[PDB]
Amino acid sequence: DTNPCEKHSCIAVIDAGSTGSRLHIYSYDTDDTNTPIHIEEIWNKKIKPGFASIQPNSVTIDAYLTMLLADAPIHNIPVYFYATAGMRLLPQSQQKKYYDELDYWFRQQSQWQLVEAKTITGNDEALFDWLAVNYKLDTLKSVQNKSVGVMDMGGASVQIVFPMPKNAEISKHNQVELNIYGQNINLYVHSFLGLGQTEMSHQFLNSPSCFANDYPLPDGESGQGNAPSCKEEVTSLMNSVHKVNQQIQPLLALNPVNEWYSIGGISNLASSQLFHFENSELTNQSLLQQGDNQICHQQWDILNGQYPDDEYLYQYCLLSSYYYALMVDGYGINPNQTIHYIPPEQNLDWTIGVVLHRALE
Amino acid sequence: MDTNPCEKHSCIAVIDAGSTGSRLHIYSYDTDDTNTPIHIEEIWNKKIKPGFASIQPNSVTIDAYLTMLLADAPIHNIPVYFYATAGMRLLPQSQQKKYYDELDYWFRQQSQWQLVEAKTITGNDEALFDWLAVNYKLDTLKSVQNKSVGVMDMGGASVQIVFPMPKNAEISKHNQVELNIYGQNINLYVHSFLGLGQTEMSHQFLNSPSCFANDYPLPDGESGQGNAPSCKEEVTSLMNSVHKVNQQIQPLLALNPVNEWYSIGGISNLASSQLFHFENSELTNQSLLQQGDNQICHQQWDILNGQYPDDEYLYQYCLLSSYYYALMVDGYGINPNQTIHYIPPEQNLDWTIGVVLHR
Ligand SMILES: Nc1nc2c(ncn2[C@@H]2O[C@H](COP(=O)(O)OP(=O)(O)NP(=O)(O)O)[C@@H](O)[C@H]2O)c(=O)[nH]1
Ligand SMILES: Nc1nc2c(ncn2[C@@H]2O[C@H](COP(=O)(O)OP(=O)(O)NP(=O)(O)O)[C@@H](O)[C@H]2O)c(=O)[nH]1
Ligand SMILES: [Cl-]
Ligand SMILES: [Cl-]
Ligand SMILES: [Mg+2]
Ligand SMILES: [Mg+2]
Ligand code: NA
């Protein structure tokens, strides 16, 4: 429609992630419970870097919010600004500086109506991850006979979320009950702060097994790639430090997931020119093999010169190893189980979940 | 110190471009018979935040940053060494290049500062400078030493350890340095651990209730329930199960004992908080861990926060006490009752005097 928000409800949801912010404007209608239906993305804009990486002063906040919002084709609508793991790495005292400046920016203008601007927990983010994916799969309308699990592979945290009946023995913070479209859904949620790709990588930059042969490690040693070896190193951070296996595997053993979907960074890796997967799905076995043979075991100078257009390339041995460590050695997923990934051209994040669910923990 | 010292002595500028900020130092010095610097004195300094690697590298932001760092210095017509450390080492060379190409251009557009080097140094180079700087200040370089001095630099993104060790052909050449200064031959073991600096390592423990004061609000919505011995075991898993600190350092330190330990970097800021009780600018790991456990881990966060409201790092003190013990005792193998000297934090001592001595 010419102006969609004249005939439908519209809100703006901003995903303020660790590596960038994404504005989405959604139009929707509501059913007879006032629940959104027919959700359509009418605009998006993605900027970098992340909000938490900028200096929190009025000039810098204005430049950033102007870049994010000023060219939108629709305004005069409510805005939800929800920041994720990049902000969670800062204490409340530091985050307050950002929100006081952001709140002032919104008060000083008239085109957007700020409703909320806050850092959400990783558990809230995980609920939104599951809602957004399941909305896109059309699995929310009716009671499913299949369990759908979602993983969001972010830059600073990763989330996992799947159906699990309410359990008096698990923290209330890791369990969510919602009623949507007249069904009652109970989920386990967990986020692992520091296990996102950027933050994790900072522990392995001097691991020769994690980089192509002769890659120049920052300590002056040479890469000598070997994905199974790098995977074992990353598993030590997953399990000896974060205890991912002990927290997740007993729960998935009791609440098996029939279909896994992943969003976040893994879509970019799996879709890159170095990897080959069909049907927008992968297995961990194939992901680790491809990284091992196409990056880890190659000569870095040669490979870098072959693929000059990919600034992410140098990390692909490490990332393929890390995803396997996280999914197989941490979550316990079978290396041969299909993991669907949402094509990156969709730019799909968790923001549709906010449209559907306005509460937070 | 003279009026206009650089009109009367040789001067150089050394910039420590660290992960949390950049520090310009200008040193005047005389030279001995071998044209080696002596009488090194800091005649200016300026510290800015954030780190150079944290900015977006384009001509506008680089200009603003270097202007902020340099413009008000009292003399500009001197050699400059710009050495970045672990914040830049977190980035691949292709990304670093953007920063140095802009930096180089900026220096070429002006006609006073004489840029000699602008580069990222390795953790091993940084460790050498750490040792030189601390030993210069202790006055132990002029003559051969009755004792072994070890230096630790507890930075934001990496930590360094450095101590005397005869050459060992079984150990990487990268972890050993031989130098001759003031006519003496010195052999050092050097190592840096990227990712084990305080800021970087803290990002793995923010949701660990044992690492924060009681009722501190963790990012996941749970509450702090501090216990320093439990938090220390979590950090030790990162030191040893992930980075293998103990396997790399302990066998060498056992055979090349250090008589006196000195530390620069974060530990000086922590140890100087009035929550702690230390004397003579020194501590032991056992005392640090016990004091963090009692004064922070097991106290109510609201009480502490209201008592020290000026102190932006307070909330981390249970974690930091635990982390320093995990790194020094469980990682390096230092006895927990061994004295660790810390340079008083008001000195703001970094490794930059090492560059004056080495270049
Ligand atoms: N291979 C590749 N990776 C990309 C590309 N663009 C972004 N990434 C990486 O994908 C990872 C996941 O990114 P994303 O899910 O957007 O993270 P985020 O939402 O910013 N972080 P968080 O959710 O933790 O706050 C990030 O480390 C990012 O650095 C690309 O073009 N290619
Ligand atoms: N406890 C405490 N820590 C502080 C204070 N001010 C700064 N720090 C922290 O002390 C640590 C060491 O800082 P510094 O030595 O300047 O690190 P750097 O040189 O910027 N980093 P690097 O050497 O790894 O490149 C950092 O993690 C910094 O965030 C303070 O007042 N108290
Ligand atoms: Cl290094
Ligand atoms: Cl969280
Ligand atoms: Mg995200
Ligand atoms: Mg430093
Ligand atoms: Na980190």
Q: What is the 3-state secondary structure (H, E, C) of chain A?
A: CCCHHHCCEEEEEEEECCCCEEEEEEEEEECCCCCEEEEEEEEEEEECCCHHHCCCCHHHHHHHHHHHHCCCCCCCEEEEEEECHHHHCCCHHHHHHHHHHHHHHHHCCCCEEEEEEEECCHHHHHHHHHHHHHHHHCCCCCCCCCCEEEEEECCCEEEEEEECCCCCCCCHHHEEEEEECCEEEEEEEEEEECCCHHHHHCCCCCCHHHCCECCECCCCCECCCCHHHHHHHHHHHHHHHCCHHHHHHHHHHHCCCCEEEEEECHHHHHCCCCCCCCCCEECHHHHHHHHHHHHHCCEHHHHHHHCCCCCCHHHHHHHHHHHHHHHHHHCCCCCCCCEEECCHHHCCCCHHHHHHCCCCC
For chain B, the structural domain boundaries read: 1-121+350-359, 122-349
A194 near B CB under 8 A? yes
Query: Ligand 5 (ion): which residues have CB within 5 A?
Result: A 17, 154
Are A1-120+349-361 and A121-348 in the same CATH fold? yes
Check whether domain B1-121+350-359 has CATH 1.10.1240.10, yes or no? no
Q: Are strands A281-282 and A148-153 parallel, antiparallel or unpaired?
A: unpaired
Does the C-beta of A65 come closer than 6 Å to ligand 1? Answer: no
Query: How many pairs of residues across A and B have Cβ atoms under 8 Å apart?
Result: 99
Which residue has the CA at smallest separation from atom 10 of ligand 2?
B266
Q: Say what angle helices A92-107 and A58-69 make with each other, to 10 degrees.
A: 60
Experimental technique for the deposited model: X-ray
Does the C-beta of B20 come closer than 6 Å to ligand 2? Answer: yes
**Counting ligands in written order, which one lies closest to the CA of residue A120?**
4
B241 near A CB under 8 A? yes
Fold of B122-349: Nucleotidyltransferase; domain 5 (3.30.420)
- Rounded distance, CA A322 to CA A210, Å? 9
Maximum alpha-carbon separation in chain B? 65
- Residue B28: CB atoms within 10 Å: 24
Q: With CA atoms as reference, report the closest residue to A339 among A285, A290, A291.
A: A285
> Min CA distance, A341 vs chain B (Å)?
26
| CATH for the stretch A121-348 | 3.30.420.150
Q: Which residues of chain A neighbour B241 with C-beta distances below 8 Å?
A: 236, 240-241
User: Do residues A262 and A337 make contact, with C-beta atoms less than 8 angstroms apart?
Assistant: no
Does the C-beta of A157 come closer than 6 Å to ligand 1? Answer: yes
B234 near A CB under 8 A? yes
Check whether domain A1-120+349-361 has CATH 3.30.420.40, yes or no? yes
A309 near B CB under 8 A? no
Which residue has the CA at smallest separation from atom 8 of ligand 1?
A265
Nearest CA in chain A to B311: A93
Q: Say what angle helices A284-291 and A316-324 make with each other, to 10 degrees.
A: 150
Q: Is the dihedral of CA B331, B334, B336, B340 positive or negative?
A: negative
- Rounded distance, CA B95 to CA B74, Å? 33
